[PDB]
């Protein structure tokens, strides 16, 4: 019901034109009608429209020059007047002549000393999926987007500064990155730097952060404006000597390393949600860097780190398979042979030399559990809650498993202090999830780990929507078998002796695991065989084989979109490992400066073999 | 416009629709004026009637599509006249709109096979498209046919 | 047999030409022969052809100008003579010269006061898949389809009205939509509307229905002539202001809503059989509409509807698993332990406070089942039987499951009142079909259920044709096993003690389910090992794995023509939900009019952003102007080239 009111405003506009005698004449080039109406009678021209119009706004918006010039004689003050409220706030008619790319009207408007710094703060101008455009606020910025050069050149020469900011703090430079037409907006970025002839004490216009603190270089990284990102690097690279087909260039490396607090490119690349921004890692001053940070100094710690964790889970299992057990206590098998269990868990007996060893190993799990949680205390206290799940699916979607591994060990640590009975169930989940967590290290050892990328990509999506179609075909047929074997003696055919297990029975048939029931000695009821034949032709001949082909086709739509996932994930492994590990080891990468008298910036060189035979 | 081909109508009709800003079926001085001076320059609003009355066959002050079509008959397309690309376009174009699309070219290649990926089809169209609408003209298609 | 009698009459024609001295001289322009034969002798020129020709017809049909001009002097009246019978009835020679796209004989024929109002009511002119054309009836309509402008124009100047109708009631406009050359016939549609200068007070020619009540606007929607549908949309949109690169028009939205009784577009789209008619839902005023009908007001009533169905089935299963049961009555297991069963179903035992709860829910399932039939009373009584199948396959192919669910509930309501024995056999069918019928809601709840289209699409066709070649290989081999273990004692290997179970036994070996018969303690006969390995090598190594690959290839021929079936099925779900649901909720879509001084028509506006396309608009302006994987992709163009080129 929200945007419904927007249209209802907009139809209400046109009706005012169809009922005002002035404005309908202003909609057309009605020279004679506006001649006799204005100069003769005594009626005001301050008739605001449905969204706060003037006569001059409509004639501008319906691109009509000659009727607007006649209005200038009657209007000394309609030029300064803005539009009123709630969608188009503050927008004077100087804007509309700009958006229509000329009318030879800004000539006449600046002849009438039009203000060049009115700020269009209306609702239909904020950056949002609701509006179809984002042009900023100031009228100098508007001509930048429609790419009209001499209209821009005209606007500087009447004193419009190039350093205004919107509510978002974004400059007129920042608007050009967000535009959809890329190469046709490239020259404006050249031309606007050309009119920065005042070398300012503050910064030369290219270093202004917004309200979220972003230079227009880095903002190109987030939105993935690749062709523009190729162009902005061109100023920074400082070429050295050329030798035939060789060229040893030198890239700048200041605003893309992990040194500062701003995180500067790399954490901002992986924390995007946009898909196209991962394309930036193919570009040549960046692609070279992560190969250096991984093949040196990143790989061997990560392989050494996984080896320590691999001994952790082993030392957990060796203090898992030895538990304090005893014979069954005084209670005999009081249910008639449906109750077979025999040991029940010693109470407070450690008095052996052997359990002295186990108490050491049992503590090794406990201290290791606490270290994990102390890592994840500050993390959820800083990265919100939903923000953490924005981090999650890309390169850390385990990150509750390592938490819940630490959770269950603290559960079973309490469970033996109070020394209660049902202690096997926390021991179960911690044992499986401990081994499942070591698949996190599959990124290394070579590129024989995009399986764990793909097996994430497929356990969500494909298998997830397939289970609901399982979950009801399994539900009727299992409910049907329980009725048809209600009559029978379950001494033969113990599949279906009560309604809970007949579900779990049917789930075993549905994946063709349990053997399929038969007796061959008792006449089983006839409605079984008609029903069960109808089960198999659905279960293991239609539904399950459909799952393979649906698995098959979805595997090669994502072949090319597999290898970019891996090389994306290595960076997220890298930068997190840099961030949580202190220095005095694996130094700030690239060659230092200012010992060579070059500057406090640090650099790296890259050679290449050229072309043009 | 003595004889033409379907494509030559269809593409020029897309031109006439793009050029007619208000969709009234006619072309007036106000309409031709703005879009011409949208493209950088500015005619001094006397060339505009000199543009129309040069070509307005009945002098009604408007340019309807038949007058628009016979103007493009004098600004006739070049000597690219063939027979097989004509036939090749009919087998490709299902609905016969004159513009072979993305999913149509996916469809015809699918019946030949070879399993084109969605990105691989987009690499085909974007290089073949000269003006940049993501759709291939009849004139654009022969330039991929003859030589590279 | 019917096509030969058409063909035999055609060869019967030519013999009449090869025997007549006149018409053979009329097939050629043998003016020397034609002059002497006519003026000298005393023979009439009323020599009828085998399909009832005249000699004047032949010169037009073999396009021969100078012969028929001589015929005008001898024959003043044969222009007025139609053709005779059963294929070309009433076809005058004015038709035939028009079909040859000119002869400049229309000059001469209209100089002989030829009627333009003759009607070709013949057999081979009616719309049919037997014929290859459809030109309509009137000579104005014949000039329409060959696209000859001056031939059309000449006919208006002789009193030819444009409002003729065929036996279908189609105007000349409706003929143009059905012509297969689409954009080359788009131009004629503008040309004829210009000759509606007399605005008649009935309707201005663009509103006239046919005998099945169809506007020419709607008719393109039925046949999927999108380009013509694109063109007729142009006269209905009404543009407002433009703002730089932005544009805000205002679409008409009158004949595309479910307001009137005419049903007006959308029911007529989904009720067709043609595949290419589903394409219209991509076009711009329609795709935008049904999204607004779905995301607002369409989805949330649909999901809230299905959850009531979910509590219905759950309430059925609770009054399914609790049945009145007694222990087995006095009859002991009288067959020798081949008869194990133990309860036999309490007769009239309700006298418990517990079963009154069961009495509650068992009624509710009966109450709801009546309501299902009450919805489906008028549907079967109006929409034929095969007509119901036309509704079925596209978007509603369940629709009998929900009928048969209503049977079996009423069977078990009967079956406990008489209280007969066999009450389990409806309770099976009334249970599995109930849970399967919730898969109707897989369209909704997200786009994570287009499977239910593909699992429809594949359970017919692929699995269906695979079932027979199962059903014979199994039918021999099951019959084979019964012969070889006929001799044996079934106390060991009790698979095959009798024939009808041996088929069911063999059916589990075919799908790799049962264990595979072996004993390893008692020697089984020496024909078993030869037969069984030969069975295994086909059934679970050749035949069954052939199914997966045959299922493999058919997944991605229909990768594209699956996703639009899903988006089509929402629209069909939407309208059916609208029709059987009253108003005073989810109002008539779009924005109402005539408060704004526009009229009773209702509208919606659409904003869109164009592009500039600077490189194309230079060359049109100068027409005004006065005095990567590139090598991979280009190899596919080469693969497009080499496969097409001549070969
Ligand atoms: Ca125009
Ligand atoms: Ca004209
Ligand atoms: Ca097409
Ligand atoms: Ca193109």
């Amino acid at each position: 019901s929200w945007a419904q009111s927007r249209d209802e405003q907009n139809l209400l506009q046109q009706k005012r034109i169809w009922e005002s005698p002035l404005l309908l004449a202003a909609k057309d080039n009605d020279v004679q009608a506006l001649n006799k109406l204005l100069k003769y009678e005594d009626c005001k021209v301050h008739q605001r429209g449905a969204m706060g119009e003037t006569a001059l706004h409509i004639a501008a918006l319906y691109d009509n020059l000659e009727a607007a010039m006649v209005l200038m004689e009657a209007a000394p003050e309609l030029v300064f007047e803005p539009m009123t409220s709630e969608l188009y706030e503050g927008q004077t008619a100087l804007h509309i002549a700009v958006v229509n790319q000329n009318m030879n009207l800004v000539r006449a408007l600046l002849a009438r000393r039009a203000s060049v710094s009115a700020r269009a703060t209306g609702t239909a101008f904020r950056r949002s999926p609701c509006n179809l455009i984002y042009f900023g606020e100031h009228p100098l910025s508007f001509a930048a987007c429609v790419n009209s050069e001499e209209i821009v050149r005209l606007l500087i020469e009447h004193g419009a500064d190039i350093r205004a900011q919107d509510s978002l703090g974004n400059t007129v430079l920042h608007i050009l990155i967000l535009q959809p037409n890329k190469t046709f907006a490239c020259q404006m970025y050249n031309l606007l730097l050309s009119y920065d002839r005042h070398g300012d004490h503050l910064q030369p216009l290219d270093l202004v952060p917004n309200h979220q603190g972003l230079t227009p270089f880095k903002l190109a990284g987030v939105e993935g404006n690749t062709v523009m990102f190729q162009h902005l690097m061109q100023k920074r690279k400082h070429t050295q000597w050329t030798y035939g087909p060789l060229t040893s260039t030198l890239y700048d490396l200041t605003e893309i390393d992990s040194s500062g607090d701003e995180q500067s490119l790399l954490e901002l690349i992986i924390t995007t949600k946009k898909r196209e921004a991962r394309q930036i890692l193919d570009q040549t001053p960046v692609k070279e860097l992560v190969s250096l940070k991984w093949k040196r100094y990143g790989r061997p710690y990560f392989c050494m780190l996984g080896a320590i964790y691999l001994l952790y889970i082993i030392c957990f299992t060796m203090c898992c398979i030895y538990r304090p057990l005893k014979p069954r206590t005084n209670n005999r098998t009081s249910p008639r042979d449906n109750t077979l269990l025999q040991q029940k868990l010693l109470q407070e007996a450690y008095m052996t030399p052997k359990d002295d060893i186990r108490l050491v190993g049992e503590l090794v799990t406990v201290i290791g559990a606490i270290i994990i949680l102390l890592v994840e205390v500050p993390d959820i206290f800083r990265m919100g809650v939903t923000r953490f799940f924005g981090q999650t699916i890309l390169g850390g979607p385990f990150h509750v498993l390592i938490i819940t591994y630490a959770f269950m060990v603290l559960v079973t640590m309490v469970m033996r202090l109070i020394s209660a009975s049902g202690e096997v169930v926390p021991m179960s989940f911690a044992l499986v999830l401990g081994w499942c967590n070591v698949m996190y290290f599959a990124r290394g050892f070579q590129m024989l780990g995009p399986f764990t990328i793909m097996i994430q990509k497929m356990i969500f999506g494909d298998l997830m929507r397939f289970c609901w179609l399982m979950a009801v075909v399994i539900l009727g047929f299992a409910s049907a078998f329980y009725i048809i074997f209600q009559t029978e003696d379950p001494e033969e055919l113990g599949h279906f002796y009560d309604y809970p297990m007949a579900l779990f029975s049917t789930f075993e048939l549905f994946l063709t695991i349990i053997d399929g029931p038969a007796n061959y000695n008792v006449d089983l009821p006839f409605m079984y065989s008609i029903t069960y034949a109808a089960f198999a032709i659905i279960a293991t001949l239609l539904m399950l084989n459909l799952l393979i082909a649906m698995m098959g086709d979805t595997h090669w739509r994502v072949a090319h979109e597999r290898d970019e996932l891996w090389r994306a994930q290595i960076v997220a492994t890298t930068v997190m490992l840099e961030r949580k590990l202190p220095r005095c080891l694996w130094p700030r990468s690239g060659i230092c400066g200012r010992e060579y008298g070059l500057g406090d910036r640090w650099f790296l060189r890259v050679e290449d073999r050229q072309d043009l035979n | 416009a003595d004889q033409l081909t379907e494509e030559q109508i269809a593409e020029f009709k897309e031109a006439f629709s793009l050029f007619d800003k208000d969709g009234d079926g006619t072309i007036t001085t106000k309409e031709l004026g703005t879009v011409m001076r949208s493209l950088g320059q500015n005619p001094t609003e006397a060339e505009l009637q000199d543009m129309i009355n040069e070509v307005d066959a009945d002098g009604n002050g408007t340019i309807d599509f038949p007058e628009f079509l016979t103007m493009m008959a004098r600004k006739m397309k070049d000597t690219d006249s063939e027979e097989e690309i004509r036939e090749a376009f009919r087998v490709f174009d299902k609905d016969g709109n004159g513009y072979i699309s993305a999913a149509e070219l996916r469809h015809v290649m699918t019946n030949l096979g070879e399993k084109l990926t969605d990105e691989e089809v987009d690499e085909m169209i974007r290089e073949a498209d000269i003006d940049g609408d993501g759709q291939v003209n009849y004139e654009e298609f022969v330039q991929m046919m003859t030589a590279k």
Side-chain angles (χ1 to χ4, degrees), chain A, chain B:
Chain A
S1 296
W2 185 66
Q4 183 181 4
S5 177
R6 181 171 176 175
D7 298 337
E8 190 172 2
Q9 295 294 109
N10 203 358
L11 286 174
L12 188 65
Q13 181 174 2
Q14 298 296 319
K15 185 175 179 179
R16 299 294 178 91
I17 293 100
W18 291 107
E19 72 186 4
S20 296
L22 178 64
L23 279 75
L24 194 149
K27 187 178 180 181
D28 302 335
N29 50 3
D30 294 334
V31 176
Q32 303 297 321
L34 292 168
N35 194 1
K36 187 169 69 69
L37 182 58
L38 270 71
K39 70 177 179 64
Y40 179 72
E41 297 174 355
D42 295 335
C43 179
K44 294 181 182 180
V45 297
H46 299 280
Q47 295 177 356
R48 303 294 181 91
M51 54 186 69
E53 303 293 334
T54 62
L56 204 151
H57 287 96
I58 304 299
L61 183 141
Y62 288 95
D63 64 9
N64 194 2
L65 179 62
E66 297 176 355
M69 297 300 292
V70 181
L71 292 174
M72 289 294 173
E73 302 297 324
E77 62 182 1
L78 287 180
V79 180
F80 298 102
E81 182 66 32
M83 295 176 69
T84 305
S85 285
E86 291 102 12
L87 278 81
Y88 300 169
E89 294 184 356
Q91 178 179 0
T92 191
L94 176 58
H95 301 91
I96 298 170
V98 169
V99 180
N100 285 319
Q101 189 176 1
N102 196 356
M103 206 60 68
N104 297 321
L105 182 63
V106 186
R107 303 286 188 183
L109 285 170
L110 293 181
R112 301 295 184 90
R113 62 188 68 189
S115 177
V116 301
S117 182
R119 296 184 66 190
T121 180
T123 309
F125 297 100
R126 288 176 175 88
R127 179 181 174 181
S128 173
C130 299
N131 292 317
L132 287 177
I133 37 90
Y134 176 68
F135 291 117
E137 299 174 357
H138 281 81
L140 178 56
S141 297
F142 286 183
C145 294
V146 299
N147 195 352
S148 303
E149 290 184 355
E150 62 181 359
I151 287 92
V152 175
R153 295 185 186 274
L154 202 278
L155 287 174
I156 290 100
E157 296 181 355
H158 295 85
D161 56 350
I162 39 89
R163 287 186 175 176
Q165 295 181 2
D166 58 347
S167 297
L168 297 173
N170 294 319
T171 69
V172 64
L173 294 174
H174 291 85
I175 307 300
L176 297 176
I177 292 98
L178 294 178
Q179 296 296 319
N181 190 357
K182 294 179 174 67
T183 180
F184 187 64
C186 182
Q187 290 85 15
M188 287 298 177
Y189 188 77
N190 290 317
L191 183 57
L192 267 69
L193 284 179
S194 298
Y195 288 93
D196 197 71
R197 298 295 303 275
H198 173 69
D200 196 0
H201 295 284
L202 281 77
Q203 62 259 12
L205 183 61
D206 205 4
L207 301 179
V208 183
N210 55 1
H211 285 92
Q212 64 185 358
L214 293 177
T215 66
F217 183 78
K218 298 180 180 69
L219 180 59
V222 175
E223 298 295 327
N225 194 358
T226 60
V227 183
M228 189 56 71
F229 183 77
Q230 183 62 256
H231 187 274
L232 267 72
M233 194 65 70
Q234 193 67 255
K235 192 266 293 294
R236 295 181 181 178
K237 60 193 292 182
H238 183 76
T239 177
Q240 291 179 355
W241 54 271
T242 66
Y243 184 74
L246 271 76
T247 296
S248 179
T249 184
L250 182 67
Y251 293 107
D252 181 77
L253 188 67
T254 304
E255 298 174 350
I256 53 174
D257 194 76
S258 299
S259 295
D261 197 5
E262 194 183 1
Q263 306 155 354
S264 72
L265 197 60
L266 291 174
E267 296 192 0
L268 274 75
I269 284 176
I270 49 94
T271 52
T272 191
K273 198 177 293 295
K274 286 180 69 67
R275 180 64 188 172
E276 299 176 356
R278 284 84 187 268
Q279 187 55 255
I280 304 300
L281 273 71
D282 204 4
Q283 296 298 317
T284 180
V286 175
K287 183 182 75 174
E288 191 70 29
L289 178 59
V290 294
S291 177
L292 266 298
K293 283 184 179 290
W294 170 250
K295 186 179 262 77
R296 187 181 298 120
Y297 294 156
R299 184 180 179 91
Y301 284 175
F302 180 75
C303 184
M304 187 271 288
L305 192 67
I308 291 172
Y309 180 75
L310 192 272
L311 298 177
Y312 181 78
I313 300 297
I314 292 297
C315 192
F316 176 73
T317 57
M318 300 302 290
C319 69
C320 175
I321 67 170
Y322 293 98
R323 295 184 296 164
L325 266 66
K326 61 191 291 184
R328 180 180 170 91
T329 176
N330 53 2
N331 45 5
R332 272 78 58 92
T333 66
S334 177
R336 288 178 180 174
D337 299 332
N338 212 166
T339 179
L340 177 139
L341 59 92
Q342 201 175 3
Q343 304 304 316
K344 198 185 260 78
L345 61 99
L346 280 171
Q347 176 61 43
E348 291 300 323
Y350 277 174
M351 58 294 291
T352 60
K354 286 180 93 288
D355 292 333
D356 298 332
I357 294 171
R358 188 181 67 189
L359 184 61
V360 174
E362 205 271 334
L363 283 175
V364 179
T365 64
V366 178
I367 304 167
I370 303 170
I371 296 170
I372 295 168
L373 291 176
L374 295 178
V375 173
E376 303 296 325
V377 166
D379 182 76
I380 310 168
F381 287 165
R382 290 184 291 174
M383 299 304 293
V385 175
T386 309
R387 184 69 56 84
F388 180 73
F389 288 103
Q391 178 67 41
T392 294
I393 303 171
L394 177 62
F398 285 163
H399 276 89
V400 62
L401 275 74
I402 186 62
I403 293 176
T404 53
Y405 176 71
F407 184 77
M408 294 293 173
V409 178
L410 269 72
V411 174
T412 186
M413 191 63 203
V414 173
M415 195 67 76
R416 284 176 60 186
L417 292 179
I418 308 171
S419 302
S421 180
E423 56 181 353
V424 297
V425 50
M427 290 299 293
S428 299
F429 280 165
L431 187 61
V432 46
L433 270 72
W435 285 100
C436 291
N437 206 166
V438 83
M439 197 176 292
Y440 179 76
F441 296 104
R443 276 85 56 87
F445 175 72
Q446 268 176 355
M447 46 92 206
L448 289 319
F451 284 84
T452 179
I453 288 298
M454 191 177 180
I455 201 169
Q456 176 190 353
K457 186 71 177 177
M458 192 261 287
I459 195 59
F460 291 164
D462 299 338
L463 192 275
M464 190 62 204
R465 81 259 195 102
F466 191 74
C467 183
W468 274 290
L469 266 68
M470 288 186 174
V472 66
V473 176
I474 199 169
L475 193 60
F477 271 146
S479 181
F481 289 168
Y482 178 70
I483 303 301
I484 197 57
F485 285 94
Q486 187 65 257
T487 310
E488 301 291 319
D489 185 5
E491 290 178 352
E492 310 294 326
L493 287 174
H495 288 272
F496 296 148
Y497 70 101
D498 50 350
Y499 189 75
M501 200 174 180
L503 273 75
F504 179 74
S505 177
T506 305
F507 180 71
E508 291 179 353
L509 281 88
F510 185 73
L511 284 82
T512 314
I513 295 171
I514 204 63
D515 200 72
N519 197 9
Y520 291 159
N521 204 359
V522 174
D523 181 74
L524 44 89
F526 62 97
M527 203 62 205
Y528 164 73
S529 295
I530 297 171
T531 309
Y532 178 64
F535 177 72
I537 196 167
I538 301 301
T540 179
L541 186 61
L542 182 72
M543 199 77 202
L544 192 147
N545 283 318
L546 187 275
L547 195 276
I548 287 175
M550 181 265 169
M551 184 55 218
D553 197 2
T554 191
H555 173 67
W556 69 279
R557 267 92 162 94
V558 297
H560 293 170
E561 194 186 3
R562 191 176 64 195
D563 185 74
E564 78 174 3
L565 275 308
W566 186 64
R567 64 185 68 253
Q569 201 187 13
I570 303 168
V571 175
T573 305
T574 301
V575 182
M576 181 186 73
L577 196 143
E578 184 179 357
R579 193 180 71 190
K580 289 182 176 68
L581 204 283
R583 288 183 182 176
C584 296
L585 69 160
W586 79 285
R588 201 268 208 88
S589 175
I591 304 301
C592 176
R594 63 90 177 174
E595 190 275 335
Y596 297 97
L598 210 286
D600 302 335
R601 300 182 181 94
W602 292 13
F603 298 93
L604 68 97
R605 64 184 291 273
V606 167
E607 296 176 354
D608 54 353
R609 194 173 191 272
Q610 210 181 5
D611 201 1
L612 59 94
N613 51 1
Chain B
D2 295 332
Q3 70 271 16
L4 292 174
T5 68
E6 300 172 355
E7 312 294 321
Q8 295 166 353
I9 283 97
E11 189 173 2
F12 287 166
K13 185 172 70 69
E14 286 293 327
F16 180 77
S17 65
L18 186 145
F19 191 78
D20 195 2
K21 191 173 180 181
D22 56 351
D24 57 355
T26 63
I27 300 170
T28 66
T29 65
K30 184 183 261 79
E31 299 175 1
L32 185 144
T34 60
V35 294
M36 183 176 286
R37 66 104 184 84
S38 71
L39 203 153
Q41 58 187 356
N42 48 357
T44 61
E45 290 181 353
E47 175 63 30
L48 302 179
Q49 62 179 357
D50 288 333
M51 186 60 70
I52 295 171
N53 296 114
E54 183 181 2
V55 74
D56 198 4
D58 55 352
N60 55 3
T62 57
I63 302 300
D64 51 354
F65 182 74
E67 283 173 351
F68 184 79
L69 189 62
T70 186
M71 182 179 179
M72 297 300 108
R74 296 185 298 169
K75 302 298 186 293
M76 189 175 179
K77 298 290 104 174
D78 297 333
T79 61
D80 185 74
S81 296
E82 292 292 327
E83 189 181 3
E84 296 295 326
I85 301 99
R86 176 65 53 190
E87 181 63 32
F89 194 77
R90 287 184 174 274
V91 180
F92 287 176
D93 199 3
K94 293 187 288 184
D95 54 356
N97 56 3
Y99 287 158
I100 178 72
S101 70
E104 285 178 349
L105 195 147
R106 287 177 180 175
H107 180 270
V108 180
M109 192 63 69
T110 304
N111 294 116
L112 187 57
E114 285 92 12
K115 284 186 178 181
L116 285 182
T117 311
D118 300 334
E119 296 293 327
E120 292 173 350
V121 179
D122 288 330
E123 297 295 327
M124 292 178 71
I125 302 167
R126 184 175 294 173
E127 187 176 2
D129 197 2
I130 301 297
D131 53 0
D133 53 352
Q135 290 179 355
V136 181
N137 297 118
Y138 177 73
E139 183 180 0
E140 290 182 352
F141 183 74
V142 70
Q143 290 180 356
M144 293 299 290
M145 177 266 175
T146 59
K148 74 278 191 186

